[PDB]
Structures are given as C-alpha cells and as structure tokens.
DNA sequence: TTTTGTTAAGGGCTGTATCACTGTGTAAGACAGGC
DNA sequence: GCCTGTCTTA
DNA sequence: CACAGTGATACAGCCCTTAACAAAA
C-alpha cells in the first residue's frame, strides 16, 4: 500500500500523476500544484463520507484559531457541573493533548464571573433610593442583614444569603443587554435609544422542602428562596408602548434569578420577617425612583413594576396576615366563607388588599368596638395578624381543571347511582357506582383509575368523549342533556384559563367566560341540586368567581402558575453537594453565586449555540 | 480556485478528477483516498511546509486538535460527566468553534468496546477446567446462574462481574505500551515472546454503606497487577511493576456485588465460581497476541488484599475475638502474651481444609473443647486461600500503644502499687497527658490512630516522659526500649528494606528478642496474659513476611465513596443495569491507557 | 467565459428524541391527640 | 358544629 | 403520582453522486 512505503517510494509510484497534475495545473490553474492537490483530496474526502477530516483540514490551511472565550468556559463549566477540580483535569489534558489552550485556565473564568455577578457595573437611582446604600460595588451579602447574635438575644439557627435587590436588578438588566437591543431591532426600534423602559419584575418566594443531605435518623433542614423574574421590558415611543422583551418560558428555572438563599422555615415566621424586611424595604424605595444605568455607550433609564404573584396559597396567607388555609375565610382575593362560597357561586369580587389587610389587624388588635373573639374575627375577615408581603395571589391553569374534574367525577358516580331519584345510598352501592365507572373508563376511554387527584386525570376526562361513555350508564336522557350542557360549558370556559394570552387568542372565550361561569351554576343549582354539601374549595371558588377579574388583572392564567419550582430543590442540592466549600459559612454564598450563574441569559445563549 | 465555492470547484477540475480517478482505479485498484493523501503530503513537503505536512499527518494519526475517542472517553470518566452532559459540551464545543475537537458519544462507545473485557482473542493451554473458552465475554451476571424461585433460598442480592481470565487478558492488554517498553528499558528485544510471568495482587472487601437516600453494603472483588517478568536464558528480569500497588487507579475491579460481606451464603455463592477460574489458570499458559508477536503468559495469584476479618471469614477461622489470635500460627492469646517472640509461619489454606474435615469427622471422638484445641479454631470449611499479612501501620500502632501504656505505668510506678485501684491509674494517665501536651503539644486520645503513634515513638518524647519519672535506671530502660523500637520500624515501614534498610533487615531478629528481653525483665508489670493480633504479628512474624512478599508496605476505604459517586452520577436508575454501568465505569477507570492521557502534561 | 443552482433516486454519519426505569420531592388526604 | 401535625402512599 | 435524568437505542435529516442546461456575472 502507498502508505505503507517511504516518501522515496510513494514519489516513485505517483511520479506519473505527479507530472499529469503538475501540467494539468499550469494549462488551467496558473501552477497551483498545491492548491489543485488539496481540492482534490478534500473533494475525495467528502466523497468518501469523512466530512470531519475535511472540515479539520480545511481549518488548518485556513489558519482560523480554535479558542473559546473564557466566557464560554464559564458557560459549559457552569451548565455541566464540574468543580473546579474537575474542569482543571479536563483543560489541561486538552491543552496538553492538542498543545493548543482550547479551554481557559481557571482564573479566566473567575474573572469572567466577575462580570455577570451583582456588583460589577455601575449605577445610578433617582432620586438616591431611601435607606439603601449608593455603593455599586455590592456582591454577596450577609442575609442576617446585621441580625444580633449575641448569647442574650434571640437564637439564630440559620445561614443565609442574598444580593442587594436594586444592584441584582443591575446585574440582571446587564445579563440581558443583548436580547434588549434585538428586541428593540426587531420591533424596527434603535440600538441607540434612551427613552424610560419598564421593568415588569415577577417576585417569587417558595420553601424548598427537605434539603439534608444523610448517611434513618433524617434531621430535616428546610430552605427558603427568594427569586425574581424580568417578565417584560417595555419601552414608551409615543403614547404607546412597545414590547421589546418578553420572557419565553416565565416558569423556567433557567429564568428564576435567585435573590435570597436561606435555610430556615418557611412557617418560621420570626426569621422569616428578619431576612425578608430588608429585601422588601429595597423594593419599597425602588418603587420611588428610576435607575439609569450605561448599556451599549448610551444611559439608560429603567422604571420597575414589582408584581408578588410567585407566592403558593399558604405563603400568600402567611406574609399577608391571613388564617391558615383550613380557615372558613377560603379565598386570598374576598371575604367570603366556605358556606357563603358554596351558596354564592358566581358573584364575588377582589376585595382583599395589602391595605385593608393592614387595617383589619389594627382593628384586630385594638378592639376598636369592644367586641367578643367570634364578632371582632367576623369583622376582620380573619386577619389576624400584621401583613409583611404585599402579594398579589393568583391561580394556576393546572388547578382550574382539577376543580372541574373532581366536581364532574363525583357527578359521574352520582348520576350513575340516580341519586337525582334516590336520596340514600348506603357505601356498599356508592362504591360498586364508582367500580362501575371506573372500570367502564378503563374499557371505552382507556384510563387508569387514580386513587387520588391529579392533573391528566382531569385532563383526558374532560371530555364529551367522556359524557357519551358515562351516558351509556345513565337511564334517562334529560340527564344525558343535562350532562352534555354542562360539560360544553366547561368546554367554553377552559381557553380563557388555559391559553398564554386570552385577550389575543379567544377574545369570544374571555367577553363569555362570566355569562358561561353564571349558566353553569344556574344548571347546578337547578337540575342537580343533590350536590351541593355547604362545601367547595379554593380552585372551584377562584375558577367561578375571580378568572374574569384576575385575566383584566394579568392578562393571563397560564403564565403564573405555581409548577416550575419544583425543580428548584433538586438544584439547590446538586450545587451544595458538587460546587460549594464544605463550610456553612461559604457553602451559601457559593451555592447563591453558582445559581445566579446558572440563570444568566448570556451562557444559555453560548449554551444554546447550535440554533 | 479556492475564492470558488463547492460546485465551481467540482466544475473546474472535472477533468483533473477523471483523469485522477482512471490513473487511481488503474493503479491503485481504486483507492483514491490513499492517492491524494499521498499526492498532497508529497507536495506539502516540496514546497519545504514541512509544519503543514506534519500536522496534516498528525490529523490522520488523530493527535492534533481533534481529540482520538479514547482521549474524550478518558476526560469524560474520569471527570464523572453523564452521557447527557459530555453531549452538550460537544454540542456546545463544536459549535462555537466550528471543529469538533471532542468526539460524539457513539465514538466514545466503540472506544470503550477495546477497553472492556471480552475484546481481545486468547487462548488457554491446557484449556481451562470448566470455563468457557469464549474469548468474545464481558460482563456477566455475578449470581452465576444461582436459582432464584420462589422455593428456592431467597436471593436479596444483585451484582455483576467479569470472567476472572477475560479480565486478566483485558489488563494486560491495557498495559502493552508498558510492558513492552519495559522490555526495551532491560536491553530486550521487541519481539520476545519467551514466558512472561504476571504476579498478581488479589484483593476483597466490603465497602460499607452504599445506599442513596436502610443501609445498602456492598462487597467488591478487585485484582492488581503486581509485577511482570521476563525470562531471557535463566535470568528472570522483570519488565514492569506497579510503582502504586495500594493505589485506588490500578485495582482492578473483578466482582462488584450488593450483599454484606459477612452474609456467608451469599458471598460464597457468588464469590465460588470466580475462585473456580482462578484455580483453573494456575496450571495452564495464557496466549496472546502483543504487538503482532504472539507471547504467552502465566501467572502467580495472591490473595493479600484481605483485613483480618475477611481472611477469617474465607479461611474457615474463628471471629476475631478467638483465642486462636494469629491467621499466620497456632498460637493462643495466652501463648502469644507469654512467648511473645519465637513463633512461625504454620497456617496453609490445605491445612485449614483438613482441620475443618477434622472437627466435621471427630475422628478421635473427643469433647467440643478437645477437638477445638485439636483444630485450632478451624470449625468452618474454608473457600479463599489467601495470604494473610501485615500493615506497617498495624505495627506502629500496636508498639504505640504498648508504649503508651508502659509511659503511664512507669509515671504511676505500678510495681510498687500491685492492688492500685482504677481512679489512681487513671490519675496517672492524666497526668502522663497533661505533661505530653505541655512537652510534646499532644492533645490526649480517646482512640489510637497513626498520626499519635508517629509523633509519640520519638526518643525526645522519651526525655519528656522521663521528666516525670524518678528512677533514672528505669529511664536506661526506657530509652533503650524506644532505640530498639526505631531500629525495627524502618524493616516494617519501608517499600522494600533489601534495599532501603539493609542493615535493619539483618539485625531485626537481634533486635526484636532484645526488645521482648527488656520486656520480660525490666517491664513485667505489663503482663497479664493479653496481647493483639498486630503486637503479636510485628514481634514474630516481620521477618517472614519479608522473606515471603519482599515488602510490608505494598500489600479501600476511597472504593465507598467512589462505589457511589459512580452509581449515582453515570449509571441508569434501574436494578436490572445500574451495577453493569458502574462495573464498566469503574473498570475504564483503572485502565493505564486513559490514564496515561490524563497525564499528558508530565 | 467563469461561477453556482438544479433536477431525480439514493447512501452513509450525525444529532436528538425517544426508550425503559426507578428515586424522589411535593402534596393530597387520612387520622388521631388535645393525659 | 374542630384543629392540626403525622403518616401513607400515589 | 410525575418527572428528572441515566445509558442505550431508533429514527430522521444531512450533503452528496451520476449529466446537462444555464443563469448570474
Ligand atoms: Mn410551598
Ligand atoms: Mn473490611
Ligand atoms: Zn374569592
Ligand atoms: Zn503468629
């Protein structure tokens, strides 16, 4: 074979072709024997299938450098999870391997931290926000906020961390620069313009369940996390506002900008409010002012608009002053009692405010009227105690279909047992009703039985599909028509809570959604009044009273769902366990710094970088 | 021409190319690539571009800026990156540069495939007894075919592991570069393929709990080569040995199971047929190709690597607590304490064999105490022949604590005190602690370790302990004591004390019947008829050892947390295939290829 | 006169979209003490 | 016409 | 439960490969 033999030999057997090549090139190419040879091969090289020797051949007579920027290191050791050590090992074998520093060395990647952590660029507030330091060089801060740990004082069990939240807010802004200037281009905007941007920031607040870490005898350790989500940057040209940034996948975790990690309880309620006052006194002042801040050479002046919607039903209740959820007081948004929610199912309205809230634990706590517990309880509407989160409670799609669904299973199994005709039913005869739908589910729709409540459960069986197969096991039809227009009413109602923008998508949906919600529960009230116990819950409450009214508040159901963080636990455990020093003291501030890391728009594109 | 794109080019050298691909199909039988290959090397070198040459050449060798699969697949284990995450920094990689510097994930495969057992072709002469002679085997179920219905004992355990001869076949062929260099590095040819000999180190243990969370144990069979030599004519000159023997990096692993290693049943269960083969290669020559030369292999099997508790376990002895305190000899606690000095190697593994058959017969018809001092404490069947042995820092902490209870005693002066009570001698040790941390800075003990034990055997730790003695004939005593003690440890403690401490070597008999001289006259206050396997075993049998394994030193508790690292972050979340990915994981772990790529820089 | 696109049928690498599979977090009910 | 952790699994 | 996240696996999409016209330059 040619390569077997010595470049004495290969020269023998091709002189030949050699000498073809040499006039071919000088009748056609001018004498680039050099060039036309590697044509050729590269040519033969695809022909055989090997694009990859190709492409690497083509790269090195092109001379083009093969080295990343130790922002991408930082990206790919970052996304993946590699410590330190092990993203040592890994650059210096590479740069040893192919003698060329394809991945930067671990000071590189420091210093590029440096720039997309809080802290580095500068700012400005006007006017000075109040009681919040004009230093801009703030990184990681102590999460105490200066707490006194004296052996006199109060114990403090817990280890937290946070940014400064106006400096975040920088830090944040900064991190989408890019896709703020794309934005405007693409909205036929300048690069080079100035005028006031808001800001709808998405405040969060969730605790993460167990976080140990155990060899049994499970010491439980609980955290809290503080977030933050930039959901839409507008820019006002004209009388109108212009939308040059909306965050694609505002549940995602890669979005959630972590601004406070604590381990303590969330029912903790004293540390609670020592770690939290601070962020929300930064908050608060930044509500008064406007930030202006240098991106792309020019000043830029940003407006915020702080919305607490990522609060879970008993967080709402515990930062607002509210009862516990077990309370007659069933709604966030209204005063009204489970009976009274049950009677009244259509017309309510949202009432409850951060300052009403205020007010009525200053009448709690005054007695202004010399009233007994039971009559002081019913004037405050159960709050109890002082508000310390301006929230604004919401409902998630998910839940919507949930209350629906178990309404119309326990419709099912009734309407099965003709309790329309028979008051009493002993538990014998309910059960083989419910055995009878479940098994007939299971042979004509396919489903599994659950024994408990879930999401796709309630999905797949809201359906007409459904009604005609529980119908095949109802006697008569007026029940069957019953049946069918209740369900077409759920039907109707369903896009407003499900969609990403109803006003858009199914304006008819949303203008109906309240006379549809009213016929409803006329037909449940008239021609199914067997089911009706003084009983219901928070979801069926908020999904027939309170969809219209928080729609005209968001615009949107979908989108304030209480489903990503779930993954956030998971998370918080990886980088405590692979990427934090082993002290409690550092292992906090190295899990913050890390996940702020892990959520910069700038890596996920480098991350991304295929599409 | 180059300005042009794909199609012009196409277009323009039509004619080049059929003429190239007539000459290429008329010559060369149609091998084209070969052809221009050749053609442009040959010009890069004309035109005096020799860089442009040489990389070229690399980049068909694969050694410059693209990375050759077993390089990605050595980075990729040995930084613990799932499949998931080795892929998106490919991704992410070859995308913003535009060259594919790692390699994808099927490449990475099939590089593993060379690497795992079951690749390369082999034969056994005589074959083996009652083993396949399929050479194309890798991972295997460890339970070996055992039973598992429901009438049949329950099986509680899972685990997989390689055939014992597969693996050693793997293992060598890992470490060819190696061998063969070293052959060059003794003036030996190339070619050679004259009776190579393999020593190898074979070990076990249990690796704790394992569980992610009930406790999980876990047992791990592992091998190491030791030493390979060579004979030319009649000199034996060895071509390799291992320069970490008790590293973690060359232990290779043989058997990785779920069970905990004193549940006997399942351990011989599964442990049986990997002793099996082992027996069947200790009479038959291994063949195997190296370098193109067939060369032949036979090898010397030593089962070293096993704790007291484990050689007891598989030897059929007692539990630890037996009078019956050495794994080496005969002796009792009592006669071990009293003799202390004069005793010999004994135990063999058929030796254990047949006093198990004489406990199991009764032959002499003797009582349950008769017959346990007629076998010496040998009342199980024994299933592992192994090599019991020493760890230097067994040796240091026993003299340690011997003399630490000798300090505190000479503080108290207990001769003079037979009927001291306990407060009174734990006064004595209080003070011999405070005075430690005021001389020495010795922070008082609970529990002895080697880091006490090296700072404490110091001659100046003598002066300071002989700072609270009044007798100064009793501190020529001590002194003397703490010389000999320095003059044993280095036979011990060194890697190979033919070498390092010859003279120690020698004079170590002298030395140790000296030591347990002054003990028996000037110390007998610490008699009381109780001594410890590693006191007894560094006063009578230091030197056998040597004689025996050369070395004290060279023959786990990182194979935990590396057990689990690997199960929770490169293994699928499923019973039935989580030991297979992690035996896999460990088994590229330990081989000297990808590790030689990981230092690269050296 | 010099560069590229293009048709049609069809052949390998490569990229990602699943497989199957279990641990695990979260939460939905069940349930029992308030001696 | 109860409250509220603990526990059990889905 | 739902889903995350493992290594293995199945499937689709990739740029071509024969001749010829020919459109842009
Ligand atoms: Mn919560
Ligand atoms: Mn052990
Ligand atoms: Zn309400
Ligand atoms: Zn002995």
New binding site residues.
Partial sequence: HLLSLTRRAQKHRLRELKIQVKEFADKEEGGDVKAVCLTLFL?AL??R?EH?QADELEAIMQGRGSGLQPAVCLAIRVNTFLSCSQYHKMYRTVKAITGRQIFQPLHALRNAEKVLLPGYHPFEWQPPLKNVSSRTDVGIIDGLSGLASSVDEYPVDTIAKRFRYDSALVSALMDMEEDILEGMRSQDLDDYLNGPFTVVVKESCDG???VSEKHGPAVPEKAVRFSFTVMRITIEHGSQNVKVFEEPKPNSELCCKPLCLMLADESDHETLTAILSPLIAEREAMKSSELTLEMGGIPRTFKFIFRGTGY?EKLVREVEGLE?S?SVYICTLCDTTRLEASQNLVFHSITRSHAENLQRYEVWRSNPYHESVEELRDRVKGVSAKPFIETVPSIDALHCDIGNAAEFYKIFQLEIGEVYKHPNASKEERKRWQATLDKHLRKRMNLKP???????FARKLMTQETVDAVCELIPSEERHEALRELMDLYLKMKPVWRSSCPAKECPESLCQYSFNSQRFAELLSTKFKYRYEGKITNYFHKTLAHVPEIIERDGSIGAWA?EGN??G??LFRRFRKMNARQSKCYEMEDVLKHHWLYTSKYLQKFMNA?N
């Fill in positions: 040519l695809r022909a299938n990859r993460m369940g167990d879970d516990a077990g659950i024994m408990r409540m879930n999401g796709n209480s779930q993954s636990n998971k295929h």
